Symmetry: C3
Subunit: 159 residues, 3 copies
């Protein structure tokens, strides 16, 4: 590749994690680290999986990389409160179309968050009137001890 070819991300990786922290940002950083995406820069995106992009396990990312990432997170300082974050990726039957990435966060269980985010993806496809192939999702819940963060993401990268 003697000449860098412009391209849209072609991989999407679903990760999720949670962590306690002394401050909201430290808990967030902890959640990222727990999710396996803690030493890279997350560039928040509105969430669209580029056509022909493949869902793959999180690639080995260069530290400090500017990773276009669709994510949802929630931080709580209420002891005993269970918080969750979930990400869904609606995949089209028509491969020339894009996938839809939805995120959800709330004071609920992992199961509810995942169900809600998957439903949101479905709704997005209905709004577009696109044929839905399937929905891939991930979710995580965290029971706050003192200060915790639940985080779920779809990291877009290049294979």
């Amino acid at each position: 590749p003697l000449h860098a070819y412009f391209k849209l991300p072609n991989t999407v990786s679903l990760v999720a994690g949670s962590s306690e922290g002394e401050t909201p940002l430290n808990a967030f950083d902890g959640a990222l680290l727990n999710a396996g995406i803690g030493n890279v820069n997350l560039i928040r995106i509105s969430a669209i999986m580029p056509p022909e992009a493949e869902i793959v396990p999180l690639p080995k990312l260069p530290m400090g990389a500017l990773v276009p990432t669709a994510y949802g997170y929630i931080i709580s300082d209420v002891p005993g409160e269970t918080i969750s974050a979930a990400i869904s990726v609606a995949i089209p039957k028509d491969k020339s179309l894009c996938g839809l990435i939805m995120e959800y966060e709330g004071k609920c269980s992992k199961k509810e968050a995942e169900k809600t985010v998957r439903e949101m993806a479905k709704i997005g496809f209905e709004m577009r009137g696109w044929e839905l192939d399937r929905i891939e999702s991930i979710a995580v819940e965290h029971t706050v001890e003192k200060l915790g963060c639940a985080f779920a993401a779809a990291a877009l990268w290049y294979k």
Copy 2:
């Protein structure tokens, strides 16, 4: 002919706006993006600055999933009958070596008020810089909430 153009700074800006009801805030937001014509690309929220010599152009054909540097304003409301608006403006300088200022606004007001407000914000930015104004281009959108709606306005940066 310039190569690696996409690896350089965006040279176009497109003002788009839209609104939509949604079963959830994000679904409403997604609907507004779709209604605005940029629902199938990735919006990368930016602080809002039109690169010098860039041109305001109608929304180009964007590749789905594109990482579009976008300055935007949006408002979501679940209050039936409430009118919410979003507007975007870009102040273009007379001195073409200078950058354009992109301002975004949102609120519980009419399309007219949102646009007037966002235009003044762009003008003020130029006043703060002491830059001579060529013109201010803007667009606004209002949405009367039925159950849960989102009004959205954006300045999408892209390439020639």
Copy 3:
């Protein structure tokens, strides 16, 4: 000279610059805009990052950025329309002893003094390194405080750039 970090994903910033500023404004966005200008980073496109300084990146005074530049920036800001209210924003960059490791960028803003904001953000950076169990070389930080007259914004950032 021009670069879109979102497209040139393979080209990571190799410098980081701490800037801070504050400003009054007729609207929250105008105040925010005024703060960027006061911080010296007012005519560029800020792409917010989560806050990781790429390994081997050097802390340098903010370079002359071309207008409209897409600048990956870790930042914190606070806007207030309460007269007399003192607001602050601070940024810290924890630098590792092992240069092959990344630096951690923490941001903090609140209704407090410049001194408190900086102390807090510095502690946050220290905590980040302790959570990783990495050897901390030092913490570079900056803070700014603004006493709101009508509507003000305090802004602090770690702008990632190239050299």
